[PDB]
Structures are given as C-alpha cells and as structure tokens.
Amino acid sequence: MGLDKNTVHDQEHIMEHLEGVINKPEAEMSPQELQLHYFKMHDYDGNNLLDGLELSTAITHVHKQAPLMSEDELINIIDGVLRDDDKNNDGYIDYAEFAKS
Amino acid sequence: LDKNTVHDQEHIMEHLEGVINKPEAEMSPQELQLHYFKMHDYDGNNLLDGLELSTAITHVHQAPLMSEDELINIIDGVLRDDDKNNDGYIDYAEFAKS
Amino acid sequence: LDKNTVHDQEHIMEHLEGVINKPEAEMSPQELQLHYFKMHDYDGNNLLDGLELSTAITHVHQAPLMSEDELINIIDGVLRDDDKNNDGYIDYAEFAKS
Amino acid sequence: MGLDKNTVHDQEHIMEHLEGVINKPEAEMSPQELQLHYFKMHDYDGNNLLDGLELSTAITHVHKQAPLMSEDELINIIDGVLRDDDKNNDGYIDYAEFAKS
Amino acid sequence: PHRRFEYKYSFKGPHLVQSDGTVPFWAHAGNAIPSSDQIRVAPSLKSQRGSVWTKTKAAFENWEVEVTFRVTGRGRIGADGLAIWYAENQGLEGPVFGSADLWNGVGIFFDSFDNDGKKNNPAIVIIGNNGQIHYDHQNDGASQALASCQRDFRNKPYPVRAKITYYQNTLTVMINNGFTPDKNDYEFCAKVENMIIPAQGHFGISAATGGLADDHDVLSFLTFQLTEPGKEPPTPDKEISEKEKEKYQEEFEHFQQELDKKKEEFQKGHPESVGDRELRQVFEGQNRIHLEIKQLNRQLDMILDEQRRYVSS
Amino acid sequence: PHRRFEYKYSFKGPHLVQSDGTVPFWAHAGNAIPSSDQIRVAPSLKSQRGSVWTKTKAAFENWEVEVTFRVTGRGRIGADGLAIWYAENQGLEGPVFGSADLWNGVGIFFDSFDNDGKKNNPAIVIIGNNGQIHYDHQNDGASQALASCQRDFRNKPYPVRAKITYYQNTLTVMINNGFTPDKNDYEFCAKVENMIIPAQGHFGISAATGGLADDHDVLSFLTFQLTEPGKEPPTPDKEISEKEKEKYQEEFEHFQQELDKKKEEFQKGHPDLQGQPAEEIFESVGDRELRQVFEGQNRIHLEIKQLNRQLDMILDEQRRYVSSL
Amino acid sequence: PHRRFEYKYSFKGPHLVQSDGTVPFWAHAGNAIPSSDQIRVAPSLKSQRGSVWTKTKAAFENWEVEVTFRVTGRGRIGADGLAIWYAENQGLEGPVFGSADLWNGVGIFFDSFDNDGKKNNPAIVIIGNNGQIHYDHQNDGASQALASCQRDFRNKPYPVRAKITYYQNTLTVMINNGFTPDKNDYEFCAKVENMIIPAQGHFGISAATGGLADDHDVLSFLTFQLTEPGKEPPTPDKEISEKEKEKYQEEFEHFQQELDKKKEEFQKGHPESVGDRELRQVFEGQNRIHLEIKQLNRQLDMILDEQRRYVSS
Amino acid sequence: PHRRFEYKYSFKGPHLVQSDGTVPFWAHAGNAIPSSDQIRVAPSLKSQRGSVWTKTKAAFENWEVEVTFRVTGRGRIGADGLAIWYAENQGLEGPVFGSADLWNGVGIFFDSFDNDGKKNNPAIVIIGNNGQIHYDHQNDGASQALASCQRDFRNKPYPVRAKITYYQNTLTVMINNGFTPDKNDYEFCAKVENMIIPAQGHFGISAATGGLADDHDVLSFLTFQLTEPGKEPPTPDKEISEKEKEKYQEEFEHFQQELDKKKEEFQKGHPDLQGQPAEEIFESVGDRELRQVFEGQNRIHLEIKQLNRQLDMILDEQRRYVSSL
C-alpha cells in the first residue's frame, strides 16, 4: 500500500473534496487533471510543494469511525514515498516528482 | 468539627508561618481556635461557609481524597447542630457556642 | 492694495496650485480677486487683517525685504481708506467696496 | 607657557576653586596636596584621569574680561603637554604622570 | 426575603480545584480547564465548548445565584459566549453555547456574536424552553427571547458580576457593568414575570467559542436559597441568651486588630506600578463622578417628592 | 548550504492534531492544549507548565529550526516565558520553563519576566548545559548565559518567527519581530561559536506561566537538515533528462491560473464567507486601556441626560402649578 | 465695549518669521528662537532666558491681548516660567523671568517653580511696579502679588490661552486651561481694580528656565484696542447704502461652497491614528460632560431665579 | 586592541562651550544650539537642520567613536532623525539628516520616521557612499543600506550610547538601549565587513526634523584611535622604574578617601542643594496621556460639587419658605 494510482484516481473523493469552493462536479475528467487537483488540494501551505506532513495528513485523513494507522506504519509509508520519489533530496515533492510515479 | 481537630497546635503553627511567626507553645484553647477561624476565612468576610469548611477538612496536607457522599454527610451534620440562625454561614458565635 | 497688484492672473495661478488647478485664462476681475481674498485668510476666519496683508504684500517670491517704516506707512494707508467699521479687520464688503 | 609649577602652586586659585564644596580655607598647605586638589577638581568625569578636554578647560578657564587663547595656541600647548607626559600613550594623564612633571 | 448560602451548588476560589484535579460537587466536561483561581470554561481557541454542571439536583422554591465572570478577547468581536442554565438534566454537550438543545429549564445567554447582523450584540437574553423548542442560533434567539438588555461585558477592567434571582415566579437579571471592583454595584438589566420552571433541576454554566476566540473565565458561582419572611418558622430560644455573642465579638475584633498590628511591623521584618496606578486612579475618579451624579439624582427626587407633598395641600 | 525538510520532527497547521487528539511524531505533556491551528503550550492561567517533545531522537550534524509562536498577555508585564530545547533526554516536566533542569544539550529561552530587576527583559538567552549546572531562575540565568539579545516578542500583530541554526559548531539565533507579515524578514539576534551539543538529541518546545499570565501559542515548528555544499553527494543521472519537468511546469502553472480564475468567479456567486481581517484582530494594549476609559464616559453621559430631563419636568409642571394658582 | 484689531502689536502664524529671519514689528533678544509656526522663547536647556518685545510704543486707554502658548516639560516640575509684560521701556534682559527688574508697568507671571516651598505653584501672579520695587524671586512674589490663582498649564494636550484685559482701570486675567481646542472657552482666574499703568508702553513676552528645563512656545499674540461704546464717534453715512454687502455676501458664500466642492473631488484626483483618535474621543467626551454640567447649572440657576420671583409673590 | 583618547575630535560636558559660544575644535552650522551640558543639534521645531563637524581632518587606520545622545519626542512618532558621519569634506548644510548629500565616506543613520511605510522604523542604517549615490529619503535608504538593525532609541529614561568601531576594514555598531544607567552595557546592532572609507576624513554629527518634532541632544562624542596589539611600538624604559607609580597610587587613594569623608561630613552641615532625581525627570509617554486624562476629571468634580451645594440651598431655604407660610 502507498501512493497508489487508484487512490489518486478516485473521482468521487476528489469531487467530495473540492466541494464548497469548487462547485462544479463533472464525471468526465481525464486521469491527468484529477491527479493535479489532488496535488493542489493537498498543499495547504500554498507553496506548491508536498512535504511529509501534508502527505501524512492525506493518508490518515478524516472522512464521514475508521481506525487510525499506527505511527510506525505511517512512518514506513512516508519514508517509502520519500525514498523513491524525492530525487532532489529536498524533502518536498514537486509536481514533476508526483507525476513521475 | 471535632474538638481535637481544632485543638492541635502544629497545624496552625505551620499554617500562619510566612507572614506572622510568633512561636509560643502555651496557647489557650480559645487562642488557637480563634487563629483557626481567622485563617480559614479566605473571602475576608469574617464568616465561615460550607466551601471553606470543606477545604479545611480535606486540605493538601499521600492520603486519598475522602468520598463525596461522606464529605457531604459530615458537613451537613456539622451545619445541622452548629448553625443557629439557618443563614448557611457559620459565625464564631455559633463556632464557640458548639 | 493697488488694482494691478490684485488683477494679475499668474500670481494666483501659481498660488492655488497644489490642491486645486483649473487652468482658465478668462477670469473676471471679481473672480481672481475672489481667489486672492480666499487664500490669504490663513486663519480660516473669512477675514483679512493687518498681519495677513503684511505677509501678502511681502511674500517670499532676490528682492530685498521692504523697510519697516515703508511697510507700516503703506499698510496704514490701506487700512485708513478701506476699513469703514473701524474693527481692525478687512472684510470683502470693505475689500470690494474699494 | 604651559603646565608650570607655579600655575598649579597658586594657593589662592585652589582655595577659590574648592569653595562651595570645600569650605575649610587654610593657608598652610604643602605644595604636594594642592597638586592633588588641582588634579581632583579638574577631573569632571570622575574617572581619575585627565584627558585633553579637561586640560583645555582648565587652561582656557573663566575667572571673575581676559582675552581668549587662540585655538592653534591651545592645540600647541595640549599637544606639548601630552607628548612629554603621556608615557603610556593612553591619551589620559594619570596622577603619577602629573607628579612626574 | 431571607438568604441561605448553599455550598452544595457553589464553587469559589482560591482553592477551587481539590487535590485530585476536579471542582467539588460540580461535574465539568468538554474543553473546560478548571484551576485554583477560576474555571476557564472555553479557552481562546477555535471551536471550543465547555460546561460545568452540578452533580446533585437542586430543589429550591426561590433562589438567587451570583456569577462572577470575565470574557476576554483580543479582537473587537467575540464568539460565541457564556450561558447560565437552571435545567432538569445536565446536557453537558451540545451546540447551544456549549450545552445541549431542547433543555427543560431557564437559560441566560450572554451572546457576543451577532449572527442576525442587526448590531444588537453583545446582549443578555433570557430564554425558557419546556424541551420542545430548538434554539435559533442564526438570529440569537430573537423570536423566543423573553427579555433582553444590551450591555457590554467584554474586556472590562474588573470582573463582570451577574445576579440572577428567581423569587415568587419572577426572574430578575441584574448585571454589574464591570467598571468598579465593588461587590454590591448591581444595575438592573432584565426581568420576566410568571416564569415557570421545574422545582427539581441542576445548575450549570457553559461557554462556546466560534470563529473568533475569547477566554470565558468564571471566577465564582455562589447559589443562595431565598425564603419568604413570613413562611420561615422563627424557632426561638436558640440564641443562648444572646449574651455570649456580645461578650465575644469585641474580643475577636481586638484580637484581629492586634494580629493586623503584628503583621504591620513583621511584614518588614525580613523582606503597584506607574501607568497602572494612573489607570486605577482614572477609574476611581469615574466611579466618584458616577456616585455623585446618582446622589444628586436621589436629592432631586427627594426635592420632587417634597414639592409634590407641599403642592398637594 | 543545502536544506532538507524532515517531517518526523515538525508540526504545522491547519491539521496539527489527529482525530485522537495527539500531535503526530510528538509527545505533549503538562498543560499543553494541542488544537488544529496551534499548540497552546501554556494558557493564561496561574502556575501552568507545558511541553512538546519529539518522540524520536534526531541525528543531524547541522540543522535549522524555524518556530512560529505568539506570546499574548493582557498586561505590559508577562511571565514566565517560552523555551526551545535540543536535549539528550525528553524532560517533559520540571521547574525550568516547564521542563526539567540539568539537561544535556542547548536551550534557547524567551524570558518575559525580569526576576533580576535589571530591566534586561524580554530577552533571548542561549544556555548550553552539559548536565551539571542548575538554571538560576532568580537571576534570569545571566551568570551562565552563553549569549543574549534584548528583543520584545509579546503582543505583536503578526506571529513571531525564530530561526535557530546550528552549522559548523556555531549556533545562530535570528528573530523576526513580527511587525511585518512577511515570512522572510529575519533580523540577527545572537550567535555562539564553538558550541558543542550531543550528536543525537530530542527537539522540544516548552512554556511556563508564573504569577502573571500569558498565552504561549506555537503555530509551527519546521526542522531542516543542513548539509555542507561539498560533502553532499550529487548522485547524477536521476532527473530523467529533465524534459518532463519543463513539460509539466507550464501545465501546473496553467492549472494554477485556471483554478484561481474559477475561485475568483465563484467566490462572489454566493457570498457567504464573513471573513476576519487582521485589523479586526489586533489592538494595542495601552490603546485598549484608553478605550475602556472612553466606555466609562458613555455610561456617565446617560446618568446626566436622564437627570437633565428630570430637571426639565421641574421647569415645566411647576409653571403649570404657578399660572393655575 | 468695541474691539479693534492691532497688527502693529501682534504676531501670529503660520508666516510668523519673514524672509530676513525676524518677526515683524517685534524685537527679540536672548535665547528666543522664532520660527514659522511659533516662538520658542526659552528652549528646554539649562539657564536660558528669552524675550520678544514690541518695537513701537503702544498708546491705548483700554486694551485686550490674547496669548496662546504651551509650556512643555519632561519632568513633573518645571522652571522658571513665562511672563507677559506691558511696560514703559523694553528691558530685554534680566533675571525676572528673562526680563529686567524695576519695570514700570504690569506683568503677568506664570510661575511654575515653587521657590517658597508652599506647594502653591504653578500659579498666575499679577505684579505691578512703578520701578522702585525689586521682584522677590525667592518666594514667587507673594508679598507684592496683587492677585493670584492656582491653575495648571504645563503639558496640557492643547495650547493654553490667556486673555489679559485692561478696561476702565481694571485688569482681568482669564485662562483657558488648555483641555479643549475651542477659541472661546475662557474661565475666570483673577482681577484687580484701580490698577494704574502708564499710557505709553511696550508689550512683550518673556520666558526663563532654571535648573529644570521646559519649552516655552508662544503660538500667537493678538492685541486688541478696546473703546467704550459711548465715547466712540458713530461717523454715519459710510456703509454705502448697506446693499452691496447683502448683494455680495451670498455670492461669496456660494463661491466658497463651490471651491470646497471642487476640492472635495480633486483631493482624491491624484493621491489620524489608533490611540490618538481614542485620546481625542476621550477628551471630547470629557468636554461634553463638562458642558452638560454647566448647562445643568444654568438651568438650576434659572429655576432658582424663577422660584425667587414666585416667592416674591 | 589598544585605545588612545583623541581630544581634538571630541566634546563632552559640563564645559562644552567656551565663553564666546563656540565648541572647541568643532564647527557647528544650521540650527544647532550648543549649551554647556549638551549640543541640541536640531530642536523640537518644524523643518530644522543642524550639524557639528570637526574642524581638522583625522587620519586613523582604526578608530572607535562613542556617542551619547537623546532623541525626545512628545508623540509616539518622531521625525526626522540623527546621523553620524565620517566623511571627506564637511557637510554643514543639506537635505540628508541635516547634512549634504553625495558624501565620500560612511554614514550611520538613526531613522525615526518610516517613510517607506514598512514598519521598519526606528532603525539604524549603515550607508557607505563613494560620492555618486543619492540618499533615497522616500524609501529610508533601504535600497543602498549596507546593514540595518531595528532598535528603539526615543524617549528613554537614560541617554542612549552608540559605539561605532572601524577595525580591520569592518565597521561594527553596538547600541546601548538606555534602559539601564550603566555605561558599559552595549549590545550588538550591526556590522559590515570589507568596508572601505577614506584614509583621512572629518567626523561629524547631524540632526534633522521634519513634520513631526523631536529634540536631538548630544551629550558627548568620544573618539579613540585604535592600534593593533602587534603593530604598536612598546618603547620601553620610560616608566622610570615604576616604583613612584605605586608610591603615588596609595597617596591618591588616601586623598580620595579624605575628600570623600570631607564631602560626606560637609554635605549635611548646611543642606541647601535641592537635587533632581531621575525618577522626577522620567515619565512614559502613554502614561502621560493617562495623567492629563486624570487631570481632566479633577475639573469635572468641582463643577459637580458647587452644583451639589447649590441644590443644597434649594433644599434648605425652600423649607424656610414652607413652614413660614
């Protein structure tokens, strides 16, 4: 498990996340722009860079019960994401790095 | 409010210390009692109530806290036979009366 | 307070600039006199006095400062024939009257 | 002219200088302690060290008319005093240096 | 009427919190943070709800509570506010000022946020509900407000005191403006007649914080039972000749005077600020002006009464 | 130097806490109240102590830590203050700014109360202890203070940001005074050269409240690993020809433009956000003491006006009792 | 009485200093620092004396001067103070408040340092001298003081205004304590009857500073000649039918209104603080309270007069 | 390093001015008012410029300058500010802080008015100009500022002292905030390394006042020549065996003790000195705005009390007109 393609490719989760601010649900989006929407909606700081804290917030998350992941499990997941995607060893994940995998 | 609880010298001696410390181990029974009455009136109203008495009998001087029902029963028993005017307050008139 | 001293356009034209600027070289003799009377009342009292006139006829626009006696004489001559109510003040009633 | 011995040894000037604070005038003082009094009274800063400024104030001075010395003259006197008495090249004049000359 | 102190439905400093970490005879839940001096019912954080309710029920025909509290905010607008409830059950959680909706009792709400946009807030609203009416949070309960007064209690220099008295089917809310540290400086705010509440109930306080954050501290909560002067039995022959009190009072006064004298010289046996002192002097001067104007008003009223009595004949 | 963000030693908003009420990878103890936007290490109550320490030890040769905090107090005098530690053991409870004494590491103390009575406070004091020197609370630690600078960080319109950088055995503390909302206006405060610290230690931040009361919020705590430009391995041939980076950057920018346009044209379609400007959230303390004085007058006027109208009636009806008679 | 403005014995802003660097018709000497807006008669430095005196002599039977000034001090105690002289000759240098002793005229002294140690200062003292009495600086002239009132004028928020009027052998000193920016808010301070001063004399102002330093700024000095309503000749037939004034006044008002309208939109054609605004609001509120108390006093006095007229019946 | 006091480039009280009203070895121009205790470079009046420069050029490789000054203002916002220059030519008149623009040297500016509107003021700005860059007054010189620190130096209970040290081509500014009356409590403000300045230059200090008014007093200006410890020639055999130094030091100490005893037993014989403590000379600005408010009440009370007694008579005499009738 990790930053799988289907986890980002869930149109329903993206649509239910963009509600309130982006009020235009359309069930015809390509699998390209929805990954982008994921990247924009999970960058809370507005710096256009995904770091470990934002990724862990996305992975743990709260949707309405569900049990929480263990701290060691979350550490392993984020470390596996960073060790295989942060080519520039900055800690942050650029959109190009995100699109690579 | 038993007699021996208020007729002990070491508690009041270690309590008033900090502003007044006049070591005199010859206090009359009405002297240490009056000190006890003066120090436990936190509000400065020269009057004792249920809350002041409840903090008096428990204090912070280890032992587990007494039961809520037991504390309620003992303070109600104290207020029943000591209060005479049924004001909800305990004065030194009633305090020295019983 | 000669007629040509107040009936020249360039002086008030460079004076009023900074807050209001409406370049219009067709001003009536009562219009530029109107502006002259309006701006020289520094105190905002809608009234001219000796001191306001003294700073009016001198200004800072080189030429040597005028003699104290000469300034006193010319302002006394101005005040003698223009003021009618003898208040020590010059109003536009008296200003336009002469 | 300069920091002559008689200039410091004027008992009248010392006595008229210490008035107001030291009102015990006694015309029997040795030529030793009057130099001390001079040194103490001309050190306004309380640092127990005479610099050029305090010396120039003492030399120019105001006693009640007399013409003032030229600035070049005062510069020459102070530089001559400093070049022949400031042994440690500190700028300040210690009491030991004052007693040397 | 005759007032009887009730310890069972009261908390007060400076030993508010016992050794175990809770306030006696009171049950607190939510984000309440009790301490020795006061109870912070809802701290200066976003979306905070807190409530302190009595453990044992209260059975009073007529009662009077005095609540001392502060509502402190950094900004000019605060949310949501404080609430004093006399209910039938302790809700202990809900969206109506940190407590449950559909309460069966009486609630005094010190609303500080104008959800209606009518510039009425801050306000004190008395709302009664049998248990079938939902509180309208979107308009500060204006439709079901029994009575309301527009007073300010935020960022006052001294604690705001409220006296809520239910006596002979009449509920009276009197508010200290908080500008003086006097204990008996109450001003009239609101009252309602023919108010019906259950005889059995729990007292409680609560506070809620919205988008803007305010600290809602409650310093004391004294509950008094009020009884009619005629209905109370006298029960005579209980003062024990009324002579021991007279023999003891002057002795106790003398001993407390000598203790104060001892403290006077033994404070220095082994050992205010500018600006703050000036502000205290300014507030004392304003209080003097207020008192003198009130005394003039009383004098003028007496003169009016004397003139009416003179012209009556 | 080269900076790498370390997620295991950081926390930031707006999702600071999880659903179970704990800060990820951090252990909080004492009177800390972690909320979603900030961690309140010590609220405005008497005798409060709080601390948040890292769960896992950090092994960095050179590092940099950026802390955003607010210390807000009603009065002009505050107590006790804030502290940022890099220690050997997690001391989560004690008498030194809410954490234990005798720590084996370095500690930066933001002291708001001048116990020494020298008018040297508020101050930023760097104190390095091997584990054998007690903190002299009664003298603000001036005897064992490695370095100090005199700054004010209380009641500022914007959060105060501090950068503490350990690089080549030199510890540099830079303070952003918080007057400006810019996040990159740091001003130098202090530095200590030849500073020694344990190779592995726990980060932490604590706060304590004394006789006076302040609120010590911490909004973020960003930890960066600093590597020297020459010792860092380049590891080339990993950019995958760098062409797709350029091919994706303009697509990302085009999205940003489109989403900004969509937000712009739907932010006014249904205007329902109340908003909260910073002008409505900031007010000077002394000016506050002025405003209440003004309010004190608004009462007094009323007590005249009613009285005035009372005198009005004694002018009117008395005339009706004069002409009739 | 009838007032006539006199420019020859006056200085006023904002063009107080001419191009050559001196104030017109006034001769200043000592440490006076005349500037465009005000004259700093003696700055906040140790041992400073300054004075501004009139060049040409003044021959008025009755006169009235209005002096606007500020005395600002960092400390709570100031020295020495300000002085307004109507003399016979310009002393221009001396130890009596920056001016010479044995003056032949009248001097109003605003003493701010209590050399007598009686806590009377600051005070306003009217001292007259023929030219043979030395001013007693060691006790603030208590022995030779004709009149004195104890009013404060140091570090006031607004300029302190003093009206000194000599009319029909009576000198009246009226002080605006400088708490409101109103021009006509004078309060009575002192008066002396049968005061004799020479008809020929010079007006002047002066200031002196002792060990403690205060800034003595004088903003304006307007001198008015007062004549009796009956002694002034009418000289009729000089208004020129009194119709041109009525024909011109409304035209001038219309033009000034249209100029204000033009400035209203052309101020923004090409482009207060918190705390300071709050202080201004506080001082205006204090002024409104004071005005309403004065109006209540007038209403009460009118009621008293009506009651006396009624009990007369 | 080794310090030598230079009298030719200094002035200090309490005999600052001579009998002819000029400062020795210094030329003052503009609106400077040199008094015996201090030089008021620009008084609290609108549009004032003043400067005091050195008459003689000074040739120092390394130097230290200690300036004691006060900037006192009535309001919380002051203008324009103070400046200390080490230039090539004198700068008596000009638009830059009371000195001429386009100076070939170094200039330290104490700026009190934030013309840039960035809330960066008051500030200490080091500007070094070769003679071709104008001073950007509208932006507070932030574009051409070599260094800057944010300190407050207006309305302090004690004089503010600044140490400016040029040593090994590094200009270091340390500012004493003036909270404490100690003369050796300097705190670091700024430094600029590899700073180049003319070998010979004039020292000078200037002050300017804009729309708002402040008083810019200078109490002392002490200039020291700094020499390296290795380049300084020792020149031994000049102490004359050093024995008389020890033989005179204790005599000087004994005289100090005797004079102190005489002053102690004399100061109470006829007590006539009034004295002026620092508590009676210092008061905070905001507290001042409170105190006048308090005075504003002391008037209002009177207007009630008299009114009160007036109502008193209408209670009394009316009764005398009621019982009689």
Ligand SMILES: [Ca+2]
């Ligand atoms: Ca990010």
Ligand SMILES: [Ca+2]
């Ligand atoms: Ca990356």
Ligand SMILES: [Ca+2]
């Ligand atoms: Ca009590």
Ligand SMILES: [Ca+2]
């Ligand atoms: Ca009782």
Ligand SMILES: [Ca+2]
């Ligand atoms: Ca006018």
Ligand SMILES: [Ca+2]
């Ligand atoms: Ca006229």
Ligand SMILES: [Ca+2]
């Ligand atoms: Ca010396």
Ligand SMILES: [Ca+2]
């Ligand atoms: Ca030497």
Ligand SMILES: [Ca+2]
């Ligand atoms: Ca509401």
Ligand SMILES: [Ca+2]
């Ligand atoms: Ca409402």
Ligand SMILES: [Ca+2]
């Ligand atoms: Ca401390």
Ligand SMILES: [Ca+2]
């Ligand atoms: Ca300290």
Ligand SMILES: [Ca+2]
């Ligand atoms: Ca005097």
Ligand SMILES: [Ca+2]
């Ligand atoms: Ca006196």
Ligand SMILES: [Ca+2]
């Ligand atoms: Ca500037």
Ligand SMILES: [Ca+2]
């Ligand atoms: Ca700036």
